[PDB]
Amino acid sequence: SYAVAGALQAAVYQQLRADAVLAALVGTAVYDAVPPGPLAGTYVSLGPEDVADASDKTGAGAVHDFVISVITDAAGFATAKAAAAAVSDALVGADLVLSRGRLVGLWFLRAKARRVEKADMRRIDLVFRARVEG
Amino acid sequence: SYAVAGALQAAVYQQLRADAVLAALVGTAVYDAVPPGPLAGTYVSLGPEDVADASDKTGAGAVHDFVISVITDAAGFATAKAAAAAVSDALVGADLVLSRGRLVGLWFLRAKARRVEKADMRRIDLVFRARVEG
Amino acid sequence: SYAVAGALQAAVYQQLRADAVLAALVGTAVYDAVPPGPLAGTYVSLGPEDVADASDKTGAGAVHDFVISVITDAAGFATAKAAAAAVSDALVGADLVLSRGRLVGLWFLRAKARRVEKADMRRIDLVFRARVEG
Amino acid sequence: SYAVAGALQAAVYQQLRADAVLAALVGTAVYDAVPPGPLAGTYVSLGPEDVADASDKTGAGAVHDFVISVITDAAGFATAKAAAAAVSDALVGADLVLSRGRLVGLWFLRAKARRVEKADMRRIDLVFRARVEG
Amino acid sequence: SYAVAGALQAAVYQQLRADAVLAALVGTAVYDAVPPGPLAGTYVSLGPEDVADASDKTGAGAVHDFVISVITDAAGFATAKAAAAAVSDALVGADLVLSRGRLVGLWFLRAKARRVEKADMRRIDLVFRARVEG
Amino acid sequence: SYAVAGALQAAVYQQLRADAVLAALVGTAVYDAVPPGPLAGTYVSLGPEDVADASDKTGAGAVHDFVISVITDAAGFATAKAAAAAVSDALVGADLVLSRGRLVGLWFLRAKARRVEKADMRRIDLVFRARVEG
Amino acid sequence: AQNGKDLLIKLDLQFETIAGLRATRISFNAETVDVTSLESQGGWRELLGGAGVRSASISGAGVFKDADTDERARQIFFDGEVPEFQVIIPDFGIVQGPFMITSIDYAGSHNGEASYELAMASAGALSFTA
Amino acid sequence: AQNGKDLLIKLDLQFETIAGLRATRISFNAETVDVTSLESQGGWRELLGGAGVRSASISGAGVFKDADTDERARQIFFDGEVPEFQVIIPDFGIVQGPFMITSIDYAGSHNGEASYELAMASAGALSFTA
Amino acid sequence: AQNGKDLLIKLDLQFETIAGLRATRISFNAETVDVTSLESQGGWRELLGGAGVRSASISGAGVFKDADTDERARQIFFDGEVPEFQVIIPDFGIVQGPFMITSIDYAGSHNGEASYELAMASAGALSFTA
Amino acid sequence: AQNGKDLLIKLDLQFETIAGLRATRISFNAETVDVTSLESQGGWRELLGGAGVRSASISGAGVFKDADTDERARQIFFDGEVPEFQVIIPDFGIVQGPFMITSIDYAGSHNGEASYELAMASAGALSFTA
Amino acid sequence: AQNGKDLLIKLDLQFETIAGLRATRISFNAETVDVTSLESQGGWRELLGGAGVRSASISGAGVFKDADTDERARQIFFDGEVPEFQVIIPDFGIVQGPFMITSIDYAGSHNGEASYELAMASAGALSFTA
Amino acid sequence: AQNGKDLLIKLDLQFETIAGLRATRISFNAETVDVTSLESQGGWRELLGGAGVRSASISGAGVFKDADTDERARQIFFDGEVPEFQVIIPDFGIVQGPFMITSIDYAGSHNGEASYELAMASAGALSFTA
Amino acid sequence: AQNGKDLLIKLDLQFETIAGLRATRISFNAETVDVTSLESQGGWRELLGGAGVRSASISGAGVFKDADTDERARQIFFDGEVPEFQVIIPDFGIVQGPFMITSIDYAGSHNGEASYELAMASAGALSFTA
Amino acid sequence: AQNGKDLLIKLDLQFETIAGLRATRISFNAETVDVTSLESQGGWRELLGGAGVRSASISGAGVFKDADTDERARQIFFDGEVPEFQVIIPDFGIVQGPFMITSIDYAGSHNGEASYELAMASAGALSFTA
Amino acid sequence: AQNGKDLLIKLDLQFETIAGLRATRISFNAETVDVTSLESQGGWRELLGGAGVRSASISGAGVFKDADTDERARQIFFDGEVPEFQVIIPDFGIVQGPFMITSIDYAGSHNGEASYELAMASAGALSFTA
């Protein structure tokens, strides 16, 4: 998107699947591309960001408002909350390492939670603001 | 959603199904996941919150605007009002106990009321603001 | 919705079907639940409110913006105007009696008027603001 | 809608079909209810108002933003302009007589013009503000 | 729409099909009503205005925000740009002659450009503000 | 759109397919009109601008907010990021040469990134502000 | 709570409502005469209280509708008077003080109503009917 | 209620409307000369009323349309005069006072109309036709 | 954090909440008496600190609901007093100072509630219950 | 009515338009010297009119485009002058007065244009070409 | 660039963060003592520079959360002191100056949080840790 | 027209851009010394022009990014100096005047960047490179 | 209360007030003939009272409007007389004394009025009509 | 009403007004020859009237514009004369008196005008042209 | 019009102006030798004119900038002399008079300038270069 967005999704994927919680609560089912197979059904997904172009005369940066959705096949979605709670416990104030530039603050934004389809699957989006500096 | 959201829906479910009114007006039909069977038809439902991220330098919190819908198969929906009136009598200024952090104020917000489908079923949403502190 | 909403729709239904005009202009066809039969076709309907939560530290109240629609099978909808004019003549500055709390002012708001379906039926919504005090 | 709306559509229908222009440009095809037959095809239509409730402590009034659409089966809609020009020449600053109350100013508002369906028929809405006093 | 709109579309059609550029770039394919035949496929179209009622105590005028779309069957729509560039070169600061009143300024507004259908045809709208004085 | 838009899309197409990165990351698949064949599947597309008419008394200009989308058939869309990163590395502060007038600043705006269809293809729009001077 | 329609300001001719009163507001004031001394328990500001003068001001706006009493507000301003005015709180009751007509202003646009603000201020001793 | 179009301010040349008057506003004023004394029943502010001076001010804005009377407002300002002006309330009637031309300002943008405010204030004794 | 509903301002009659308090705000102040001298390490502004006076001000607004204590705020203003007022911070505790009733204002519209602001300021020495 | 593009302010070098003029505004002023006397028919404010001084001020803003005359506005400000300026009303005609260059300001952002306001005021006797 | 969370203002009890600090702002000031003389190269304004005094002011707002150090800000205001305060720029480092507690204000609504502004100003010589 | 990115304000250490400059604005000023006399052709305001002093002021804001020259702006303010500053218009060229550092302010929120305004004013004679 | 418009000074020619009478002030005096004997019950100063001479002085300000009564005062000054002057007190009544025309002065500015002060002093025995 | 621009002081060389004449003020005087005999009907002060000497003083302010009439006053001061001076009153007429040039002063600032006061006093018998 | 920057006082050492010359004011005087004989055509005061002594006084304000001409004035004060001083009037010319150094004073504040007033008075016969 902006130049940092190649490295940002890579590093927030690496801070995920390293937290001990959400590894005993989701498992290995944290991905962007879905591994085809049986579709385990309590995964998360980390793809849709958008940029709010916060830049400079000398240099330029980006505000990545990336969405991490939590999808859950369970009957209620109290299961999907603690998995999303372990997302938000892992990412606000992250201070991680990027491959192009660095980020300065990984804050938290709106996080809606609803039934996507036939009321069988439950989507909890979690928008995180990622002010990165190129 | 935020870390408190695992405990918030659990505690507002426990303050429900303990009020004496709405136990003689709905019964045991307060749930998130629907118990399959005959679908009694005058239930409520407590799932869709969203967060408005009110946080701090030192610590962080959340504004959960959770929706409690009231669904009713009766011909008119004066039956659905008093069940929703017993929702709102049970929750504004609740001062309940959470498992992760605590809430500081469970206020009241917009509460629309309409016919969802074929004008046979009537949905009364009730948005409650839950400023919790992690 | 809020606690007064059980008594508010009951009392605005009772001030209707007591006005002499709209009793010679609609008849007995003022309802929420439709009496099944032949569907007379020049009815009104009083169900969809929504609340705007105007409350207090000490006590709480509600702003019920309830919608009273006027439906008419006549070819033109000059017939539906005077029936809606007799709605608005009956309700603005009502000062009626409630069963839970009281209302302080039953004002008037937007009132759109259009063709709902196939341009055969004409819906005149009439939004009335009902600031009630619990 | 409001109490004046029974008399307002009646009087703006009577100022129409009395202008000499639009009588040689539309004919007798000014109506709300369509006379069934062959559908002449260069009519106008005067039904959908909405109210913006401008009222008082002592007395009450209404802001009727009524829509007069111009429909035309001609290939281009330069024919529909002069018919709509003869609408607007007939109604802005009208100072007509009502049966319930009176109006104080019949101004002019937005007037969009587009193709409704299959690009065969052309609808020119003309919103007029009618501040009436009950 | 307003009274000038009968003469405005007539005069902006006459300033079109008189520019030397867009006559060697579109041809005779500038119209409102489509001449039926083979549908040449690199036409423009001048019909949908809307009015923003800028008027007076003494006299009245209109703000016609008329849309001139450019449609093009070519594979890319660099062909449609220069035809739309020859539209905008022909109309901003036009100072033309009307039959009812006159215009005082024919400015330029938003001009979006997209694929309408199946990504085979490309529509470039061009909104021009026409402050006319009746 | 505006007069410069014939030359603007031509010059931003020429600065693309000349960058060394995105030539080893996309290839020759940068176009507006799609070359029919096998549809390689990791292309970009540069067509939909819109104008925000920033002009003058003496002279006139345009704000072209053109969209360059990145489409990618890969399973994840980390591949589509670096191709879009090579778009944004090629265009912000471009200072290129136009055929009609010149541009003064090619800034950066919002850049959303989502799954278009069946979640098989991924679209990364990149809106760039192009303040050109005619 | 009380209805907004019930609290009404009114002129004399015997008091009648001025026709268009979309928005009205009684506003009381005091200037807080400061009596600070060297010796204070915490250094907190010391105020005498009762000695300082006290005020009331009325600001009633809305649509210009001609009535017999709307023409009275023209008459009060041109021939300078201080007549009796009366703003009634819905529960509290009437006020019944002599006010003056400090600033009025009629306004109208090319598409709106004829509207006015009517701003008043206290000119004498007030009352309260309870 | 009254039409917004009916209340109109107008210059002399015999009075004609100034061409573009999208928004206009007559505004009356008084300064409330305070006459407070030691002995007051409740300590309420005491005002004399009639002795204090009184004002009127006109602010009429809209599109700059050239007329014979719009050029007159240029003539009143450059050659400093205090001619007769007349704002007519729709029911009340005309005012017919000598005002002056305290501040006018023509404004235009790259895409809008040529517009103007025309701000006036009272320069002499007013009237009322009833 | 604390509930917004818990911090409440209250009048005497023994203290009760004033009925409608949608928004309230205690506000403390100091005037920072400046004691700048020729010799300063960096030229930084020098302030004595403690000698300067200090203030408190309360601004509580909301819906006009008639209570026994809302009528008290009428009584405090007309008969000029400096009674005891009490704003309780949710954790901190009560304040319990003598304030006065510097400006109150009741307002109502043609469709809204009857509302009021109630603005207060310190008139004596304050306290803190901890 | 008139085009917004036609009314243009212009500098000398022989007068040319300053390149970017998105928004411009001539504004005339007078201070209304008050001559109130004891004997007045209704107590209406009395104004002399013509004796009071009178002003003009020009505020022209838009995009910073370098021209030969935009560099002139730099030259007028640094070397303090009062040259001749000329704002032409579309129907009225030109003004042709000596103004000065009281405040100019260039501004630019990280994504916007380079823009400027150019604020002027009258420095001598004006004219009108009719 | 730096994180917004890293720059923090803090009180003494040894310094701790005040609990809720949603928005904070250190602000430095100087009054620019003017030393203009007859002889100037272009007539440009001449300023001495260093002699003029210089200031710092801190404005930190957010949610009222009770901590041991939030109660300290109550203690600094009632018992008038000038203690040491410390705002740390994320890269620059800490400031460590004596400030005072010029105005604080707690505010809460019927549905919002309990919130506060905390406005401070310099009372002595500052520092910089680099 | 010119790029917004090209016009840049810069400090000395040899001049470098201050890191974050989202919005910047050079602003020139004059006070218009009035020389009005009895005899005037139309009574138009008479101004001397050149004698009056003249100013320049720079206001550059944006994200706080630590650089070697951003720390310089800390050094200019604490140790009071009037060093050379330089704002370059994209076509016009550089300015190169001695300014001072009248007010700077760093600000940060709980979710935003660390940001700053940097407000400057002229302290000596300016220049223009053309 | 009494209107300041009511108290009027007036010349003879039969009595008429002068035109510009913006501010007028009759001022009486007595020189307080001190009779302080050595004995006095607490060492208090004793005074005689009726032995003191008593005076009156009138200071009238106003704007020069030409009237015959205004020309009369010039004729009273050049042909130096001490005619009868008369000053009403609103509800007391007139004074009707012989005064002289001690010092008058006419003043005018480049923008304001032709104004004048008129200072008078007592010349004989005064009266009072009740 | 009379314009302050009308009253004009003027020198001989044939009479012409001076250039900078911002504020001028003729001021007459009489020393009030007190004739207080022991008898007086209420102990009132009696005055004689015509025995008093009578004077005139002119104080003219203005901005230094070089004129021959301005050079004349310097020549009148150095070659100390008492020539004829003439001061118009708008609708009275001229005075035409012999005055001297008692004290003049030229003043200038680092930013303002070359200004001057010009103080004159009576030197002979005056006149009045009506 | 004449610039206030043009009129300059200057010392001998060959003539150079002093450094801080913020406000300067030459002031001439004459004591008005009253020759009031008993006869005078209206009892007017008669004056002689040329018999009066005539003087000059210079009051120069400014900011202390060290110059040799500023050191000269200190040397003129301690070694008390009456050397030649020279004051330009813009378009009149110089004065070139012998003055003394009657009273000088240096002043400074905790935040402002080193400023000085310099008061001089005439010591001999003056001149005028035209």
What is the dihedral sign for C-alpha F1, F7, F12, F14? positive
* Element at M58 (helix H, strand E): strand M54-63
**Chain A closest-CA separation from residue J99 CA (Å):** 36
Tell me, what amino acid is at D30? V
d(CA A72, CA A42): 4
Chain G residue set in contact with K, beta carbons under 8 Å: 42-43
Chain F residue set in contact with J, beta carbons under 8 Å: 54, 56-59, 61, 104-105, 107-108, 129, 131, 133
Q: Which residue in F has a C-alpha nearest to residue E125's C-alpha?
A: F1
The answer to whether the Cβ–Cβ distance between O3 and L46 falls below 8 Å is no
- Express the helix, strand and coil content of chain C in percent, nearest 5 each: 20, 30, 55
Burial of I101 (0-12, 13-18, 19+ CB in 10 A): buried
The domain that holds E115 is classified in CATH as 3.30.2000.30
Q: What is the DSSP letter of O74?
A: H
* Optimal mutation site among H72, H76, H100, H117, interface J, most CBs of chain J within 10 A: H100
Query: CA torsion angle for F107, F110, F116, F120 (degrees, to 10)?
Result: 80
Q: What's the maximum distance between 2 C-alpha atoms anywhere in chain M? A: 63
Contacts of I110 in chain D (CB under 8 A): 55-57
Contacts of I55 in chain G (CB under 8 A): 45
**Chain G closest-CA separation from residue E60 CA (Å):** 10
d(CA D62, CA D42): 31
Q: Are M54 and M28 in contact (CB under 8 A)?
A: yes
Beta bridge partners of B98: none
> Who's near D117: CB < 8 A, 6+ residues apart?
none
Angle at A70 between CA B115 and CA B100, to 5 degrees: 90
Residue E49 tokens read as: 């205005």
Print the domain residue range for C42.
4-133
d(CA A44, CA B47): 19
Query: In residues, how long is chain B?
Result: 134
d(CA H29, CA G101): 8
The answer to whether the Cβ–Cβ distance between H17 and E57 falls below 8 Å is yes
d(CA C93, CA I90): 40
d(CA K119, CA I31): 12
Contacts of L96 in chain J (CB under 8 A): none
Residue D101 tokens read as: 């109350």
> What is the experimental resolution, given in Å to one decimal place?
4.5
* Optimal mutation site among B57, B104, B107, B129, interface I, most CBs of chain I within 10 A: B104
What is the dihedral sign for C-alpha C38, C41, C45, C48? positive
d(CA J53, CA J38): 25
d(CA I2, CA I90): 6
Contacts of I5 in chain B (CB under 8 A): 93, 105
CB contact E90 to F (< 8 Å)? no
Q: What is the DSSP letter of F54?
A: -
Neighbours of D131 (CB within 10 A): 22
**Chain C closest-CA separation from residue G5 CA (Å):** 8
**Three-class SS of residue F84?**
helix
Block residue for tokens 């010319």: O93
Angle at M54 between CA M51 and CA M60, to 5 degrees: 170
Residues of G numbered 2-21 whose beta carbons fall under 8 angstroms of chain C's beta carbons: which are they? Answer: 2-5
- Using the CB atoms, write b or e for F86-106: b if 16+ within 10 Å: bbbbbbbebeeebebbbbbbb
Domains in chain C, number: 1
Contacts of J90 in chain H (CB under 8 A): 64, 66, 114
The answer to whether the Cβ–Cβ distance between L74 and K128 falls below 8 Å is yes
Q: What is the DSSP letter of F34?
A: P
d(CA O99, CA O122): 5
> Who's near D37: CB < 8 A, 6+ residues apart?
none
Residue I49: name the closest of F132, M23, K123, N64 by CA: K123
**Three-class SS of residue H78?**
helix
The alpha carbon of residue D82 and the mean position of all alpha carbons in its chain are separated, in whole angstroms, by 15
What is the dihedral sign for C-alpha K77, K79, K82, K84? negative
Tell me the DSSP string of J30-60. E---B---S--SSSB--B--TTS-EEEEEEE
Elucidated via: cryo-EM
Distances (CA, A) of A101 to A6, A98, B11, D123: 11, 6, 43, 56
The answer to whether the Cβ–Cβ distance between J45 and H54 falls below 8 Å is yes
> Who's near G75: CB < 8 A, 6+ residues apart?
none
d(CA A104, CA A14): 17
Q: Are J94 and J56 in contact (CB under 8 A)?
A: no
Contacts of N19 in chain L (CB under 8 A): 37, 39
Burial of A10 (0-12, 13-18, 19+ CB in 10 A): middle
d(CA I30, CA B96): 40
Query: In residues, how long is chain I?
Result: 130
